[PDB]
Enzyme design. Structure first.
Site: not given
Ligand SMILES: C=C1C[C@@]23C=CC(=O)[C@@](C)(CCC(=O)Nc4c(O)ccc(C(=O)O)c4O)[C@@H]2C[C@@H]1CC3
Ligand SMILES: C=C1C[C@@]23C=CC(=O)[C@@](C)(CCC(=O)Nc4c(O)ccc(C(=O)O)c4O)[C@@H]2C[C@@H]1CC3
Lengths: 420, 423
Positions: B345, B314, B410, B325, B173, B350
């Site tokens: 967004k 973002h 990611f 952020e 992303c 997104h």
């Molecule tokens: C390690 C964890 C903790 C957990 C808890 C709360 C969260 O907010 C999420 C769901 C997403 C984190 C994130 O925004 N990653 C994340 C990132 O690093 C970079 C980009 C994006 C994007 O959308 O563009 C993104 O989404 C994470 C993912 C995974 C399981 C639950």
């Protein structure tokens, strides 16, 4: 600014570990094998360049647990696993294992793939058709995302500089090396772990290439014969899998830290045919232009090129186009010695550029040019070009060019000079 | 040359707010939303029910998506939806730029750099389902190039005869932020004179959505009120809302634009990209990799933090992502003053690999018109953001000179791009 390669790692159908792979290649070995019915049963393309396990190849087999703990393998598709092993090898050779944050922040990771995590993606879709999408693993997305090859390498080694993942089909890892060099020159990184990884075997990916009539079908009973770049009886490419990595840094950076340059990167060129989605023009003009840009960058005349590792994948139309490009750049009657190592490894797709760059570099290091296996009746269109037959050629050389082309009209060429 | 000033001379958008950047811009600034209930064929099994969808001309007569305007009907069978969107956005950007070279001298100096995060996911998923039902012997001869990520740049190049470098960054992303940075780099190294740069994404499928839902990354709590589901910086955010679209910019040196009489829309003054090397699907709580990417863009631009007027964050509406952020923004800009910050967004959802390019376009238009987009749904800003000037739902009408735009992904990917108003 002068740029060098200080380490190389290889995972391939000829084994894991670049010295062993090199020895096997020059000795005339082949990594082509009959595919399992689970992959190829429905298709006339029965042969592939496969990466073997330690049970099948005790000296050179692939064991990703040496680079990734057992419990973490569930988090990464095969291409990523291959990338991790190849990266560890290249980094160990280069002696690049920065503990300080300054150096970590100045290390980039640029790892190409053509198709990425196709087996993982196909499995997720198959789960969707069976157990159901509510049962997908929490790891599904990063398991197959192309940039998680570079991503997992960066996490393991704490590389905190730029990350790249060029996905420009079968030119992708040539572009990864060019992109590495460009970043060293622009000052955006001091060391780049660059390369490509591909592990795309599945009935659907193989089937997709099959439907395009791009795959060899006529040598299923004699798999080693199936990949025959430049040969009269070529009938399509042989898919392969693997990964290869190079550590790229400035000459001054290498010498300051005591790292031995293996070869120097002196030129890079990339172009687009803007012609057809799955074939290049018959005159080879896009590929020709890419080669000429790399030579211009290196300030090398065509007559100074010793060795060309051609892209030549063993397709009728593809190899003919490259023949025409090579004639335009180099002429006929003299010119460079030219071979395609896809004859032995098969087509590693987005990893082809990096493995062939590695062979080009080793050719310079050792004064040994790989031969083209199966080259029994050279295409008459190539008369006047010095195509190397099955025997490797032992000759001191100074300058090597390596080409990679892809669907979507992508051409890339990279030029190396022997060090010192 | 490395000292060349670099500008944007055209912009194209295909989005959940429509096709055509001027219409999309007017709809965004008026508080419009592209979020809609997904079809049951996509989301029927899942609890994530809302997406930013691109509508057809029946559904949106003024702004609908009709790829036959760019590609003959017979040729559409050869290209997945993300490519069809890329083609339409690219045509818009190129027409605005007046870049349509017929001579090889110029064609060879035009690059085409188009990101995607997932590429032809619907195409690939259909091939796999065909494989399970009818057999792989029934696959179309076009199967492979239909879905390959680089065939977005590829098909654009073929149509327009662009014969310089092709690029396709697939860095999740952050991807189309990197495409723009890569375009700028190529102008500065002399490897191209003009670059058509951007991103394209159309990944809706039950498996892709299911995968994101399995990572707990998607909004699930606003199915009954779709427009409320994307709420960056808000107390009640519960994950992102997937969208689809494409956006493109035409990038060239200021000197080249002036020589050919093209009017720069804005200037690109900085780009930075970094890796967290922290976790495969989350950045660190303090946003330190994002922070470093932002500082690199500022450094390249020779801009102090207090000179930034606007940040297009973002912020995708995830709990941990937006918080990271926020911390990065506080580190770079401090508290109490600093730039106006919003996330669009909130309105588009997104767009994944195409998020960077669309948000770049919005940052550029912000500078052009002196209107900063609001953050829809921002009703109870996260307290961690106290001290930051988060723009609420109303667009802010104020003259501005410098805008920053972030994209993260990611695998720990961070990228930031910095613009200055032209002149
Ligand atoms: C390690 C964890 C903790 C957990 C808890 C709360 C969260 O907010 C999420 C769901 C997403 C984190 C994130 O925004 N990653 C994340 C990132 O690093 C970079 C980009 C994006 C994007 O959308 O563009 C993104 O989404 C994470 C993912 C995974 C399981 C639950
Ligand atoms: C337009 C045609 C004519 C056709 C006829 C004979 C051929 O040889 C193939 C099969 C492959 C062309 C080719 O080498 N593409 C081609 C290319 O441009 C770039 C790279 C590769 C690669 O393998 O890395 C490649 O494979 C083409 C493809 C499509 C259908 C049959």
């Amino acid at each position: 600014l002068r740029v060098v390669v200080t380490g190389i790692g290889i995972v391939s159908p000829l084994g894991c570990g670049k010295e062993l792979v090199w020895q096997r290649l020059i000795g005339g070995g082949s990594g082509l094998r009959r595919l399992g019915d689970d992959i190829a049963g429905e298709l006339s393309a029965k042969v592939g360049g496969t990466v073997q396990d330690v049970a099948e190849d005790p000296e050179g087999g692939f064991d990703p647990e040496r680079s990734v703990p057992h419990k973490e393998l569930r988090k990464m598709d095969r291409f990523i696993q291959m990338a991790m092993v190849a990266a560890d090898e290249a980094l160990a050779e280069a002696g690049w294992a920065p503990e300080a944050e300054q150096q970590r922040e100045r290390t980039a990771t640029v790892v190409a793939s053509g198709i990425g995590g196709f087996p993982g993606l196909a499995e997720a879709v198959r789960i969707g058709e069976t157990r159901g999408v509510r049962r997908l693993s929490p790891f599904t997305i990063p398991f197959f995302l192309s940039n998680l090859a570079a991503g997992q390498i960066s996490i393991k080694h704490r590389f905190r500089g730029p990350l790249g993942c060029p996905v420009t089909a079968c030119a992708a890892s040539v572009q990864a090396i060019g992109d590495a060099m460009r970043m060293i020159r622009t000052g955006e990184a001091d060391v780049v772990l660059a390369g490509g990884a591909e592990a795309a075997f599945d009935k659907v990916s193989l089937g997709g290439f099959a439907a395009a009539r791009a795959l060899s079908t006529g040598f299923s009973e004699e798999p080693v014969r199936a990949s025959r770049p430049f040969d009269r009886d070529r009938d399509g490419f042989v898919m392969g899998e693997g990964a290869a990595m190079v550590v790229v840094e400035s000459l001054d950076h290498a010498l300051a830290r005591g790292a031995r340059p293996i070869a120097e990167i002196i030129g890079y060129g990339t172009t687009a045919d803007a012609y057809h989605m799955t074939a290049g023009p018959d005159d080879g003009s896009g590929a020709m232009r890419a080669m000429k840009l790399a030579l211009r960058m290196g300030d090398v005349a065509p007559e100074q090129v010793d060795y060309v590792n051609a892209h030549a994948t063993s397709t009728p139309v593809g190899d003919a186009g490259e023949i025409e490009a090579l004639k335009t750049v180099f002429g006929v009657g003299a010119g460079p010695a030219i071979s395609s190592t896809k004859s032995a490894t098969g087509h590693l797709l987005g990893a082809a550029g990096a493995i062939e760059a590695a062979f080009s570099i080793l050719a310079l290091r050792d004064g040994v040019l790989p031969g083209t296996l199966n080259l029994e009746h050279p295409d008459p269109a190539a008369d006047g070009l010095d195509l190397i037959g099955p025997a490797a050629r032992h000759v001191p050389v100074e300058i090597a060019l390596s080409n990679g082309f892809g669907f979507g009209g992508v051409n890339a060429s990279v030029l190396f000079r022997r060090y010192p």
